[PDB]
């Protein structure tokens, strides 16, 4: 479908921004720095660009983003077992 050929960057950036907030949560949970939060922005914008290489449906871009958010969400919880045993 031509949606995969036309999807707005403003829509991609709004979805990348939900991933950004979960990576910013790692910088809280591990107690990193403002420059390490700049590395979190770079990690999201590298992921975005590397998912765009494999974008072969809008529903595959959208579900792979959701499943990366699910992996990083689950990693917040993992880093909590490794930090405090909860």
UniProtKB/Swiss-Prot annotation:
<comment type="similarity">
    <text>Belongs to the Mediator complex subunit 15 family.</text>
</comment>
<feature type="compositionally biased region" description="Basic and acidic residues">
    <location>
        <begin position="66"/>
        <end position="83"/>
    </location>
</feature>
<comment type="function">
    <text>Component of the Mediator complex, a coactivator involved in regulated gene transcription of nearly all RNA polymerase II-dependent genes. Mediator functions as a bridge to convey information from gene-specific regulatory proteins to the basal RNA polymerase II transcription machinery. Mediator is recruited to promoters by direct interactions with regulatory proteins and serves as a scaffold for the assembly of a functional preinitiation complex with RNA polymerase II and the general transcription factors.</text>
</comment>
<comment type="subunit">
    <text>Component of the Mediator complex.</text>
</comment>
<protein>
    <recommendedName>
        <fullName>Mediator of RNA polymerase II transcription subunit 15</fullName>
    </recommendedName>
</protein>
């Amino acid at each position: 479908m031509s949606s995969k050929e036309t999807i707005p960057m403003h829509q991609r950036s709004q979805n990348v921004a939900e991933l950004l907030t979960v990576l910013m949560d790692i910088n809280k949970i591990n107690g990193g720095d403002s420059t390490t939060a700049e590395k979190m922005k770079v990690h999201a914008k590298s992921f975005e660009a590397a998912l765009f290489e494999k974008s072969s449906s809008k529903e595959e871009y959208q579900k792979t983003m959701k499943s990366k958010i699910d992996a990083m969400r689950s990693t917040r919880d993992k880093r909590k077992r490794e930090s405090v045993g909860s």
